[PDB]
Design an enzyme around this catalytic site. Structure first.
Site, PDB file in Angstrom:
ATOM      1  N   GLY D  33       0.797  -1.207   0.000  1.00 27.32           N
ATOM      2  CA  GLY D  33       0.000   0.000   0.000  1.00 27.32           C
ATOM      3  C   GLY D  33       0.836   1.267   0.000  1.00 27.32           C
ATOM      4  O   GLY D  33       2.066   1.248   0.025  1.00 27.32           O
ATOM      5  N   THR D  34       0.133   2.396  -0.027  1.00 29.79           N
ATOM      6  CA  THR D  34       0.790   3.695  -0.049  1.00 29.79           C
ATOM      7  C   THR D  34       1.480   3.982   1.281  1.00 29.79           C
ATOM      8  O   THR D  34       1.016   3.579   2.351  1.00 29.79           O
ATOM      9  CB  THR D  34      -0.219   4.801  -0.359  1.00 29.79           C
ATOM     10  N   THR D  35       2.599   4.698   1.202  1.00 31.99           N
ATOM     11  CA  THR D  35       3.395   4.986   2.387  1.00 31.99           C
ATOM     12  C   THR D  35       2.714   6.043   3.250  1.00 31.99           C
ATOM     13  O   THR D  35       2.336   7.112   2.763  1.00 31.99           O
ATOM     14  CB  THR D  35       4.791   5.456   1.982  1.00 31.99           C
ATOM     15  N   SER D  78      -3.037   1.937   5.434  1.00 29.98           N
ATOM     16  CA  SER D  78      -2.396   1.398   4.242  1.00 29.98           C
ATOM     17  C   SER D  78      -2.931  -0.002   3.986  1.00 29.98           C
ATOM     18  O   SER D  78      -2.971  -0.831   4.902  1.00 29.98           O
ATOM     19  CB  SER D  78      -0.872   1.365   4.400  1.00 29.98           C
TER      20      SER D  78
END
Lengths: 239, 240, 262, 242, 247, 240, 234, 248
Positions: D33-35, D78
């Protein structure tokens, strides 16, 4: 659901639930191999031959092309009896070998033998060869030749089309030219296609067979939607 | 390998074993943490090793010792989610016992209740056992200092002293040697601070390593309350 | 000269192991021949390549397609390996496949050793051939020269004791229902069996179905460590083919579903 | 082995080594997932998120990647978007129920425990699956500032600095360096600047992204969760670039 | 790159990788296993026609009921599994009678068709959010011919997928392909009732293996005045003789 | 098969439900039953397995069961499931008589039995009845004979003459050759003789393995004795 | 090959961390025909291309009215679209009956997301497989939302879903500044939508039989145009 | 509606055997030995308290009083035995004490326990219990009785028997050492001798558990004043008494 059934565990998928040839599985003998008889048709009279399955029937309208039946390839298997008939069609100076597949009742060995016989008979005169088929391992429509392969790993082709291509490529009578058109689900003899893929098939088949796009497209479009095998639940399930 | 439907559910293997229960037992050692419990004359002491190697963690939020009721304390060996699940269940059980029977729940009765729940988990196909080991300590008004332990198999039993973890064998051997030397089943001390110091020393000798104030958690049960010591209390106890 | 034959069994572990063997040591392996796929489900596909960037095992420039059954050869070690893409159309034709395909190849190339790789599913052990469940792998060896008495004879059921398994194997006997029993019976009862063939080795593992790439790698490591094949060198790199990048579908399809992953 | 064959096709199953592989696969889903990062300053929390630049057709003010559970609680996640939305809805419900019952905003540890119990309950039966999200949340209560991170297994901990997503390793290294270089502590604005810097460093291959920063500080926002305005956000972006 | 078995076509709640539900496709195949039914809509009424396929001559020919009356102004022809059709017909009759009871008026043909399709949806979530009622989708297709004051004469095709279409002419069953191909060429908006009946008989005769007669074929019509009526054997025999004389 | 035959709710790729076919296969193993209706009566004939030497014959249940004073029922398949079906049919007949003051019609009872059989195919936790039934009788205040056949899937049909069970194909062919719908047997004796001759095509021993029941209008049900069946068999043999 | 072992149901993760049944449900959207939505500060418009089984059949209804101030268009599985449209109608009815309120578009999007998320985490059912475009007008003005059946909702000025929707989406993105300021002139906005959906046509032409339009606005209730009512827009 | 049922966890094998019951019997055979001997004026029940050295032996007891005249012991899985003992104690009151004003006779309580164990084999939710029980008792109209109950729910009466790991040798010893004129003290001595050959480690009063069904014990009643109130007949011997009997 409060739970999933405890005994609902998936079985190994390395084995294909293909039909059995003989009811005795513990035998140590040699199973008989079916025999194929190719009827004798003037092969040099025809310059092109198209090999495909029944799912591609709408691609060949009967009225426009004046399809005519020549003879029947016979297939026989004897186990201590199975018989199959393979119609051959002709339009203009083009032959048509359309095979019906059925994973429930027809073993792939019949398809293998039929493909071997067809390729062996057609190799005696080296005519133009066109193959039309479908694969559930590809992501888009594929056009291939004897000197070019557009497939990327791990895509591949199996079934009757796979048998025909195997006989053309690594068979004893190899080196023949061919054009193969493969369209992107379902078991053998029960496959389904999308509308976009069907339209692309119509366009490419018309281009390769040399016909006017308008009338050929209209006839094929009419044939596809007349409760064809590949148009099963498209209209009634999606909007 | 279970090699069958026992790979998922708790049914008998051909050898007559329940593999899911044994695998929960194996899961009880995931945290790689040891705990010790000893009894004094009028107190019970539990000490749990704390490992916080990550510098980004807040140590004050890392604990495997829970207060179940006014007099009962619990130490858990195993993953923290199942530990918190068991802690909430035990709190509810103790409160319900007090409501239903008019007096405070004894430590051994609570251990038996949790063991019966674990038996349910071992026998039901659609329920999994919790991969934790529970140790309840208190000073019961009838039995004095009390330590009881329950496991994923549904087995529970009381101890003069106990140790749980990957290095539990050495701690248990040292405890057995000390008890054979003293020929008593408890620690002959009058203050719980002395019992805490003795248990810290025993843990240090058994594990063969030195512990600072941030490497341990200490809980003490007296006849009035069960309470957990803070960092300053443990640091004071270390100096002796 | 030894020929490695994989069997289509649970998890496709032998076949995957072959993909481990050829791709890790691609410098020593070259494409040799395509056997007849008469009894298999026929297969046409592109030419696979190792991920690390090594040259393709198909040294022929004009070759563009691969078939179901292909034999690769290692000249430095003198080892043949069979790669199979599809199973048999039926079990009844297995007796044909060993007799009309494998045995003519063994006769033609004068192969002196055949090693067969296999896997077994424990839930299907109806005859109880598994005696030591704590052991993962089993190895069996058979020699014609040593077993002269048993070769010459007239010929008590649901089990076979012809093979000799190591004491650390998980099995001591094979079941009649297993394909290996039929293969061994066809090889031993063959009238035209090659005289150069002297050793039959059988390596089997126990596992389950799923993503068996690591299981296949560990199985190959165990086979190499046991020195079942004399000339097989140890593998350190363990390179995968590029086709394995399409195991879970398209390589970059996860970024397609922006409504699910973020 | 990261792949447990024969023990990974159903939830709430123990492997011979005592592992639960479905939870581990949910962790693998989270790791793609996105940081997202969170930093705990002297008297507050700061959350920072990296966003991919989408089409101009999206309404600029209706697309916020940082969720507000309550007036004093901020949260980012995330993993799977629907799982994150479900968890945030549950957190809002829990906070509202607690505030209605006891006339005070819910303390952060109690909220964390309720969320953790809810997440852990989804690793008990084969009819459900574990949540595919890791959540970094935090806020301010009467006891001070709190920052927590919660995982698919239901395990949660309090953190001085937390990171999740694809660029979790670089972000964690930067957070460890920030903790080492500031033993005394850190202020809210310095935390905002460092969060911008850490997001920029972690992003660095398609160099096109935006940055969202939120904060809750007793001195700055009077113990309330607020998004960073234009001036401070621009200053943080400029500091990160230079 | 290996060939392995796929099992996405077994569960009704399982998607294929391309987003298909193959149990619905197999239910359509089960429909195709049935006998032929043809409907043609004109401005003077709607004509339904079915083929009576009898395995044995001992079967009572007057017992096969592929054409039923849902209401005085609504008739239906079925193709596929008979028990599923029986359940659907019971539901449709109940809906029509209840609508008459509560509103003192005839129900619209499209409304009844929508109710039947909502029932067919029950192998999943219901149209109003009801829980699942059936373990598998229906294996039968329906042709609903009706007349209402709002939309005149209407012909609808209803499938187990829960979707219905409005048709000028439609064919279902084993011979549906050739019959529909003939319908595409032989239908026009100015057909009379007699011409529609003759066309239905001709198309049935074309796609029937056995020789067409009154015993193995059945006709019915719906008109505004007379309602829904299934022709007796004598009238159908006279129509067949007239068609033979014309051809 | 091929993985599509392990549940009642699975469609085959060609549109079949194989478990229904397997229930029909179970039906095929039962003793043969025949139903033939004449101008003014219905005759049900049944094949009986040869009685053992020590088997009691006074209380052995008959193959033809009276659902009501005007409706009778015979079966082929699993004997134990037929009892459940017969009990349900009798209960339904009495319930309908109580609710509407009118006895059931033959078609109504056939539809109810078919509905029960259909209901027992709508769950993965239940097994369908492996029974095919023949229901015969006359509608109340009516003189038209009625004969119906019901299958495990829940499908029912109306027949002038029908056979079910083991070797029913030969009996069906014999009936097709020797029955005319436009000229049915005008008397009870002719119908009984035709039924007995049809049964003799597959019954080995002969008269002692044949049961005949005759139903007439106005609730007239007669079970023929062994002597009458023997006389019919002897007359048929003499005329042969 | 390895995906084949981990795509059985919605309660199973792959070893790489993927939920394949939801991905297949999302893929089911492209099997439907193209629909386009756009809006300005005063009006919101939906344009749909309808399909028929054959020349003897009718065309499918792709635009459904939920309330006098809100409607939607669908692309994907028909049963899921029917279920979701009925659910939205029920929610609007409840709002009007209990509070005398007009249900907000954002509230409807949140409700749809909550309803859709449940089917993706429990055993027994399947995820929905239809995408939706919701237009409405409320106290906050005109709103257009895109609903994806994984349980996602986005707010946009314009978008397109269905087969070959990429061309329409690119056209809408390129000309955003044009239709973003078409205030008080419904015809221009409808024409822009028609051009956008024509950008996605392949060997087909818009007719009065396969074109459907819908509009909502400040003083304009949700209105659907079919047949001759769209003839002037072709 | 696939969640409204669960398929049976116990099914027949092709040979005609229920596998789960056989595996539960195997688990019983792996347990600690427990024996029972019936005399003319009492019954003896004995077991080995196999255990950690730091565990208190008195906290965990494998011999349980079911009624003042009925006790029981087990071999197999402890938690299943504990659950069954709680259920049996409750059932003695629900079905008999609150109906007839009396405690049940031994055979009827054994039948209730056996029915509870049998119901665990006709289930799709639970697996069968993994214990074997020895139940000793006394009643007015039947005298002294000793029964064995198996995981399948079958029960049989015995003059003397043993279950567990060393069941065969103990059975041989009891067969060679049993007569119809035996007394309660002789039965206790024989039980100690039989357990001596089975215990591998320390054999004292801290590793043996003994209970008897003998004469009434007025001192254990807890009250005096009613001559017709009989004291309990179940009595568990203390560690000191076991040590005294072993020394002698």
């Amino acid at each position: 659901m409060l739970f999933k059934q405890w005994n609902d565990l998936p079985e190994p998928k390395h084995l294909l639930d293909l039909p059995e040839i003989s009811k005795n599985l513990q035998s140590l003998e040699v199973c008989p191999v079916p025999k194929v008889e190719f009827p004798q048709l003037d092969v040099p009279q025809y310059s092109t031959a198209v090999i495909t399955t029944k799912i591609m029937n709408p691609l060949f309208p009967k009225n426009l092309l004046q399809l005519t039946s020549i003879g029947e390839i016979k297939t026989t298997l004897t186990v201590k009896v199975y018989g199959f008939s393979f119609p051959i069609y002709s339009f203009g100076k083009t032959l048509l070998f359309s095979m019906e597949e059925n994973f429930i009742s027809i073993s792939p060995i019949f398809g293998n033998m039929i493909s071997r016989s067809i390729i062996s008979q057609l190799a005696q005169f080296s005519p133009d060869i066109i193959v039309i088929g479908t694969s559930d391992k590809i992501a888009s429509m594929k056009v291939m030749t004897e000197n070019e392969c557009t497939l990327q790993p791990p895509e591949f082709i199996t079934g009757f089309i796979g048998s025909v291509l195997t006989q053309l490529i690594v068979g004893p009578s190899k080196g023949l030219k061919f054009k193969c058109l493969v369209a992107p689900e379902g078991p053998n003899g029960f496959e389904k296609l999308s509308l976009s893929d069907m339209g692309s098939l119509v366009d490419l088949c018309g281009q390769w067979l040399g016909f006017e796009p308008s009338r050929y497209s209209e006839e094929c479009y009419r044939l596809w939607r007349c409760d064809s095998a590949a148009i099963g639940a498209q209209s009634g399930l999606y909007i | 390998s279970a090699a069958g439907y026992d790979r998922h559910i708790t049914i008998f293997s051909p050898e007559g074993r329940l593999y899911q229960v044994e695998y929960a037992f194996k899961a009880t050692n995931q945290t790689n943490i040891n705990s010790l419990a000893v009894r004094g004359k009028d107190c019970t002491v539990v000490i749990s090793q704390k490992k916080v190697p990550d510098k980004l963690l807040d140590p004050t939020t890392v604990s495997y010792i829970f207060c179940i009721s006014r007099t009962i304390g619990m130490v858990v060996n195993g993953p923290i989610p199942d530990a918190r699940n068991a802690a909430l269940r035990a709190k509810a059980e103790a409160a319900e016992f007090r409501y239903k029977y008019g007096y405070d729940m004894p430590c051994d009765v609570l251990a038996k209740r949790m063991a019966n729940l674990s038996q349910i988990y071992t026998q039901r196909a659609y329920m999994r056992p919790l991969g934790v080991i529970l140790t309840f300590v208190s000073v019961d008004e009838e039995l004095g200092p009390s330590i009881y332990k329950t496991d994923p198999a549904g087995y529970y039993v009381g101890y003069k002293a106990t140790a749980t973890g990957p290095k539990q064998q050495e701690i248990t051997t040292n405890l057995e040697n000390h008890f054979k030397k003293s020929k008593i089943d408890h620690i002959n001390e009058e203050s719980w601070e002395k019992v805490v110091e003795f248990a810290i020393t025993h843990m240090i000798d058994a594990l063969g390593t030195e512990f600072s104030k941030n490497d341990l958690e200490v809980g003490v049960a007296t006849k009035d309350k069960f309470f957990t010591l803070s960092a300053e209390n443990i640091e004071e106890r270390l100096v002796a | 000269s030894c020929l490695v034959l994989p069997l289509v069994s649970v998890g496709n572990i032998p076949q995957l192991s072959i993909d481990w063997l050829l791709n890790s040591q691609a410098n020593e392996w070259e494409y040799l021949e395509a056997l007849d796929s008469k009894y298999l489900v026929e297969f046409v596909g592109p030419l696979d390549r190792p991920e690390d960037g090594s040259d393709s095992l198909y040294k022929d420039a004009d070759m563009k397609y691969s078939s179901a059954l292909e034999v690769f050869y290692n000249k430095k070690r003198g080892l043949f390996a069979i790669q199979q893409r599809t199973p048999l159309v039926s079990v009844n034709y297995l007796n044909n496949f060993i007799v009309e395909i494998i045995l003519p190849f063994l006769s033609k190339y004068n192969i002196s050793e055949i090693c067969i790789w296999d896997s077994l599913y424990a839930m299907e052990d109806e005859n109880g051939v598994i005696v030591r469940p704590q052991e993962v792998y089993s190895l069996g060896e058979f020699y014609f020269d040593d077993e002269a008495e048993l070769l010459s004879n007239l010929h008590e059921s649901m089990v076979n004791n012809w093979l000799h398994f190591t004491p650390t194997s998980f099995q001591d006997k094979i079941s009649v229902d297993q394909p290996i029993f039929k293969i061994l019976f066809q090889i031993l009862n063959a009238s035209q069996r090659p005289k150069a063939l002297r050793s039959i080795k059988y390596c089997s593992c126990l596992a389950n179905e799923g993503d068996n790439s690591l299981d296949s790698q560990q199985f190959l490591q165990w086979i190499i460590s046991q020195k079942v094949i004399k000339n097989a060198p140890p593998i350190v790199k363990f390179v995968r083919p590029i086709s394995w990048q399409g195991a879970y579908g398209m390589a970059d399809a996860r970024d397609k579903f922006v409504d699910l992953y973020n | 082995t990261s792949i447990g064959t024969g023990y990974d096709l159903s939830n709430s199953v123990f492997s011979p080594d005592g592992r639960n592989f479905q939870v581990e696969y949910a962790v693998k889903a989270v790791e793609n997932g996105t940081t997202s990062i969170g930093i705990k300053c002297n008297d507050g929390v700061v959350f920072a998120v990296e966003k991919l630049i989408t089409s101009k057709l999206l309404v600029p003010q209706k697309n916020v990647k940082i969720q507000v559970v309550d007036r004093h609680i901020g949260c980012v996640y995330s993993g799977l978007i629907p799982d994150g939305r479900h968890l945030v809805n549950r957190g809002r419900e829990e906070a509202a129920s607690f505030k209605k019952l006891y006339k005070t905003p819910i303390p952060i540890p109690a909220f964390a425990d309720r969320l953790g119990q809810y997440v852990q309950a989804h690793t008990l039966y084969n009819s459900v699956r574990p949540f595919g999200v890791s959540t970094i949340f935090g806020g301010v209560d009467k006891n001070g500032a709190h920052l927590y991170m919660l995982e698919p297994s239901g395990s949660y901990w309090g953190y001085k600095g937390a990171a999740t997503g694809k660029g979790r390793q670089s972000a964690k290294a930067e957070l460890e360096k920030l903790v080492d270089h500031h033993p005394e502590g850190l202020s809210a604005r310095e935390a905002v600047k460092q969060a911008a810097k850490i997001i920029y460093l972690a992003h660095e291959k398609e160099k096109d992204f935006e940055l969202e920063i939120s904060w809750c500080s007793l001195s700055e926002t009077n113990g309330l969760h607020k998004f960073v305005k234009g001036d401070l956000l621009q200053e943080a972006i400029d500091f990160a670039q230079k | 790159m290996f060939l392995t078995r796929s099992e996405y076509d077994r569960g009704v709640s399982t998607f294929s990788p391309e987003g298909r539900l193959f149990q619905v496709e197999y239910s359509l195949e089960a429909i195709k296993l049935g006998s032929t039914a043809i409907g043609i809509a004109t401005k003077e009424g709607v004509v339904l026609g079915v083929e009576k396929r009898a395995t044995s001559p001992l079967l009572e020919s007057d017992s096969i009921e592929k054409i039923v009356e849902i209401d005085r102004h609504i008739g239906c022809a079925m193709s596929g599994l008979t028990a599923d059709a029986r359940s659907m017909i019971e539901h449709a009759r109940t809906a029509a009678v209840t609508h008459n009871l509560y509103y003192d008026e005839d129900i619209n043909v499209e409304s009844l068709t929508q109710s039947v399709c909502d029932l067919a949806l029950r192998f999943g979530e219901g149209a109003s959010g009801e829980e699942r009622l059936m373990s598998r989708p229906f294996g039968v297709a329906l042709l609903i011919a009706g007349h209402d004051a709002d939309d005149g004469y209407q012909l609808f095709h209803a499938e187990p997928s829960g979707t219905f279409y409005r048709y000028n002419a439609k064919a279902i069953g084993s011979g549906s392909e050739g019959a529909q191909a003939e319908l595409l060429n032989e239908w026009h908006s100015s057909l009379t009732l007699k011409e529609a009946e003759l066309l239905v008989l001709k198309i049935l005769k074309q796609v029937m293996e056995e020789k067409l007669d009154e015993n193995n074929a059945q006709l019915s019509c719906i008109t505004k005045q007379d309602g829904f009526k299934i022709y007796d054997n004598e009238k159908t025999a006279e129509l067949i003789k007239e068609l033979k004389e014309k051809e | 098969m091929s993985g599509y035959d392990r549940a009642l709710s699975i469609f085959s790729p060609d549109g079949h439900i194989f478990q229904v076919e397997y229930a029909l296969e179970a039906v095929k193993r039962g003793t043969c039953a025949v139903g033939v209706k004449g101008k003014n009566c219905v005759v049900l004939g049944c094949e009986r397995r040869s009685t053992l030497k020590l088997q009691d014959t006074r209380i052995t249940p008959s193959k033809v069961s009276k659902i009501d004073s005007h409706v009778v029922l015979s079966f082929s398949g699993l004997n134990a499931d037929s009892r459940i079906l017969i009990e349900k049919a009798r209960v339904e007949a009495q319930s309908h008589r109580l609710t509407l003051e009118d006895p059931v019609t033959v078609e109504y009872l056939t539809r109810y039995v078919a509905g029960v059989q259909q209901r027992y195919t709508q769950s993965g936790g239940v097994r369908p009845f492996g029974v095919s039934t023949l229901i015969a009788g006359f509608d109340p205040r009516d003189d038209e004979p009625k004969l119906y056949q019901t299958e495990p899937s829940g499908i029912y049909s109306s027949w002038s003459a029908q056979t079910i069970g083991r070797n029913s194909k030969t009996v069906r062919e014999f009936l097709e050759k020797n029955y005319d719908r436009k000229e049915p047997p005008a008397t009870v004796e002719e119908c009984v003789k035709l039924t007995v001759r049809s049964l003799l095509e597959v019954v080995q021993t002969g008269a002692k393995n044949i049961e005949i029941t005759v139903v007439k209008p106005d609730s007239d049900i007669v079970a023929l004795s062994s002597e009458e069946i023997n006389q019919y068999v002897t007359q048929i043999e003499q005329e042969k | 090959m390895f995906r084949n072992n981990y795509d059985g149901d919605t309660v199973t993760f792959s070893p790489t961390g993927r939920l394949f049944q939801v991905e297949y449900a999302l893929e089911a959207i492209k099997q439907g025909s193209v629909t386009v939505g756009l809006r300005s500060n005063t009006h919101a418009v939906l344009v749909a291309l309808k399909r028929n089984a054959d020349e003897l059949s009718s065309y499918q209804k792709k635009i459904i009215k939920c309330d006098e101030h809100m409607g939607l268009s669908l692309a994907g599985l028909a049963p899921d679209a029917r279920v979701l449209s009925n659910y939205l109608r029920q929610q609007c009815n409840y709002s009007s009956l209990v509070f005398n309120r007009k249900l907000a578009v954002e509230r409807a999007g949140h409700l749809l997301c909550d309803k859709a998320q449940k089917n993706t985490q429990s055993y027994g059912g399947r995820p929905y497989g239809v995408g939706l475009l919701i237009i409405g007008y409320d106290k906050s003005g005109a709103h257009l939302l895109e609903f994806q059946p994984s349980g996602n909702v986005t707010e946009l000025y314009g978008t397109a879903i269905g087969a070959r929707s990429q061309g329409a989406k690119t056209y809408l993105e390129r000309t955003l500044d044009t239709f973003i300021k078409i205030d008080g002139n419904p015809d221009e906005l409808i024409k822009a939508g028609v051009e956008a959906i024509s950008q996605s046509l392949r060997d087909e032409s818009l007719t009065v039989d396969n074109l459907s339009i819908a509009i909502v606005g400040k003083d304009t209730p949700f209105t659907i145009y079919d047949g001759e009512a769209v003839a002037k827009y072709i | 509606m696939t969640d409204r049922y669960s398929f049976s966890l116990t099914t027949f094998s092709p040979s005609g055997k229920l596998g789960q019951i056989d595996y539960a019997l195997t688990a019983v055979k792996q347990g600690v030995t427990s024996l029972g001997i019936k005399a003319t004026n009492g019954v003896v029940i004995a077991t080995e308290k196999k255990s950690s050295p730091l565990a208190m032996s008195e906290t965990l007891s494998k011999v349980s009083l079911l009624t003042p005249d009925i006790g029981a012991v087990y071999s197999g899985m402890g938690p299943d035995y504990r659950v069954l003992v709680d259920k049996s104690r409750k059932v003695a009151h629900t079905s008999y004490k609150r109906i007839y004003g009396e405690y049940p006779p031994t055979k009827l309580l054994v039948s209730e326990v056996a029915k509870i164990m049998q119901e665990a084999t006709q289930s799709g939710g639970v697996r069968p219990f993994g214990v074997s029980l020895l139940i000793a008792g006394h009643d007015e109209f039947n005298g002294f009785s000793l029964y064995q109950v198996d995981p399948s729910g079958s029960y049989f009466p015995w003059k003397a028997t043993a279950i567990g790991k060393g069941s065969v040798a103990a059975k041989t010893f009891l067969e060679k050492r049993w007569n119809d004129e035996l007394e309660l003290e002789d039965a206790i001595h024989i039980a100690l001798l039989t357990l001596k050959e089975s215990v591998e480690g320390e054999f004292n009063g801290d590793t043996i558990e003994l209970a008897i069904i003998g004469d009434e014990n007025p001192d254990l009643l807890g009250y005096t004043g009613i001559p017709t109130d009989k004291g309990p007949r179940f009595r568990k011997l203390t560690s000191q008494e076991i040590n005294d009997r072993l020394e002698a």
